[PDB]
């Protein structure tokens, strides 16, 4: 069977970036031509591989991570980047081998008055390790004052809603991101190209 790339790219709802979804794609034939020749994508950057060279390569596993962020934040989905998203939500390794794909989803993920259902982690004690996920919602203590609950001025609920509005500037509009992670372990190669 052909790889189910359409399940990831064309899903109706994407996860919040702090709870990014990972889809393992294995034991299938991957026609990467549908992806690069789509022209509907606003970002298609690969690291360490070319899309043309990917049609003729094989890999043990291919992971497809997907989420929604702001347009101005897509630049953080790249190796060696800093910022709220890369530090606290989704971290790519410095030696990342794979592709980062994003498109504008303002038509799908914005709401008049705001879409509060997409969130990102704004507070965290330590930066994330590559491909680490954190979906906890413990109250964050920002000062030297203890935190009973969020009731303090320095006690924060750690997630933050984007509140996507259709009339946002393009940089603030929601973008759907799919991160293709190509893994080649010393094991049978289950994913190949046409």
């Amino acid at each position, epitope marked *: 069977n052909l790889c189910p790339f359409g399940e990831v790219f064309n899903a109706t709802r994407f996860a919040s970036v702090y709870a990014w979804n990972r889809k393992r794609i294995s034991n299938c034939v991957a026609d990467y031509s549908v992806l690069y020749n789509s022209a509907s994508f606003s970002t298609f950057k690969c690291y360490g591989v070319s899309p043309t060279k990917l049609n003729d390569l094989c890999f043990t596993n291919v992971y497809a991570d997907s989420f929604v962020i702001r347009g101005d934040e897509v630049r953080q989905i790249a190796p060696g980047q800093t910022g*709220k998203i890369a530090d606290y939500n989704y971290k790519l390794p410095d030696d990342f081998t794979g592709c980062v794909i994003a498109w504008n989803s303002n038509n799908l993920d914005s709401k*008049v*008055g*705001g879409n*509060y*259902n997409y*969130l990102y982690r*704004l*507070f965290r004690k330590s930066n994330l390790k590559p491909f680490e996920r954190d979906i906890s*919602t413990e109250i964050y203590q920002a000062g030297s*004052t203890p935190c009973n609950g*969020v*009731e*303090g*001025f320095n006690c*924060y*609920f750690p*997630l*933050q*809603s*984007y*509140g996507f*509005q259709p*009339t946002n500037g393009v940089g*603030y509009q929601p973008y759907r991101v799919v991160v293709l992670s190509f893994e080649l372990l010393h094991a049978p190669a289950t994913v190949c190209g046409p």
Partner: nanobody, 130 residues
Framework: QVQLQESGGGLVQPGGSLRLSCAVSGFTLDYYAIGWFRQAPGKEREGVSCISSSDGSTSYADSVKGRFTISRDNAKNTVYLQMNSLKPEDTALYYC???????????????????????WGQGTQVTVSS
């Protein structure tokens, strides 16, 4: 569309008072928080007070608690900061900011995180003479 504009400020002697205003225009978010922040020379911009758009709940930094009052006139959609009993350490550039409330598990949170305010004003200087 969205714009926050500060007014008020200036020079006062210690013990004096000021009233800052923040005109919020073009705002369409259903639920949001509006906060006053300040940045003293060489220091990091810190939050001073925060107010909810839904019921006017307020929170204050410890350094200003009891002296500063944040309030909102929903008619004019203007947020005010009444600053009483001013001290030299209150000297800073003062900003108002707005950010959406956060929805999680059936509940909205109204927070004014200095590092996550989607909309900022231009800032107005406040100088307490000493």
């Amino acid at each position: 569309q969205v714009q926050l504009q500060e007014s008020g400020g200036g020079l006062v002697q210690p013990g004096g008072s000021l009233r800052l205003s923040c005109a919020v225009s073009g705002f369409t978010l259903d639920y949001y928080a509006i906060g006053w922040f300040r940045q003293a020379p060489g220091k990091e911009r810190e939050g001073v007070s925060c107010i909810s758009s839904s019921d006017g709940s307020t929170s204050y930094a410890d350094s200003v608690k009891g002296r500063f009052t944040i309030s909102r006139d929903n008619a004019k959609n203007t947020v005010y900061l009444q600053m009483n009993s001013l001290k030299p350490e209150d000297t800073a550039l003062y900003y108002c900011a707005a950010t959406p409330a956060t929805y999680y598990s059936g509940r909205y949170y109204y927070q004014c995180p200095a590092g996550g305010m989607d909309y900022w004003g231009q800032g107005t200087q406040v100088t307490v003479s000493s």
